[PDB]
């Protein structure tokens, strides 16, 4: 059987929910305490638009190490938390860094606003949607807690990698 | 590998003596569990060691957590070990 493998990297400031999103996707439950400095990679077999895909997903915590992660990565999930302004401010830095390392103006990415289950919100949909627009990438809101948008964020990133 | 584990337990006691101002004397490993992590270009392991050491002459039980990171930089393996925690049972 034909399969296509994709190399995906999850990046964002500490505490935005990188570990939680990945483990939701992989394990179908919310991990509210996962070591904040541990990195791991995961493999999930999934059908996206009829293609049998192997997603090799790296959960970063963040170096030469980090540079390697970015050369190897094909698509990047840029995560902030909707109740943290500075996590949203940091996004430029991550995107700039990836563009620096890979040395390309077009790098598959998706902007993710996580924790959208929460009644507090510091960042507006429109602010995020404007940023995504300026970079020409898609924006999904998600909750690692309730699984809202989780599948969609990863699938959307795969679609982005295909586009290139 | 019982050697490897024993060497890491000795390392844990040593690092506890140096960084937590103690003078425990390693006796033996009582049990070990091992958790593995493979971020890209790494083979990392957290060890959970239960060990026996003498505190002012008296045998007591301790739980040590030791982190071993092994990373391929260029085409060369770089190895790193670090005591994470050490506490009495
Ligand atoms: N309510 C809610 N909490 C979340 C969500 N994602 C992560 N968290 C919590 O926020 C903290 C950070 O999660 P973690 O995945 O460790 O963040 P990381 O540092 O980016 O890997 C943890 O206590 C999580 O339980 C979410 O979507 N909703
Ligand atoms: Mg994490």
Residue numbers in the entry:
A (entry chain A): -1 to 60, 65 to 166
B (entry chain B): 4 to 92
Tell me, in the authors' exact words, what the paper reports:
The crystal structure of Affimer K6 in complex with GDP-bound wild-type KRAS was determined at 1.9 Å resolution, revealing that Affimer K6 binds to a shallow hydrophobic pocket on KRAS between the switch regions. The Affimer K6 binding site overlaps that of SOS1 providing structural evidence that K6 acts as a SOS1 competitive inhibitor. The P42 residue forms no interactions with KRAS, however, it is critical for function suggesting it has a geometric and structural role facilitating the interactions formed by W43 and F44. W43 of Affimer K6 and V7/L56 from KRAS form a hydrophobic cluster strengthened by Affimer residues T41 and Q45 forming hydrogen bonds with KRAS switch region residues D38/S39 and Y71, respectively. Affimer K6 bound both forms of KRAS with low nanomolar affinities and showed a significant preference for GDP-bound KRAS (KD = 1.36 ± 0.87 nM for GDP and KD = 7.88 ± 1.09 nM for GppNHp, Student t-test p = 0.0095).
RAS mutations are the most common oncogenic drivers across human cancers, but there remains a paucity of clinically-validated pharmacological inhibitors of RAS, as druggable pockets have proven difficult to identify. Here, we demonstrate the use of Affimer proteins, a scaffold-based biologic, to identify and directly probe two druggable pockets on wild-type KRAS associated with inhibition of nucleotide exchange and effector molecule binding.
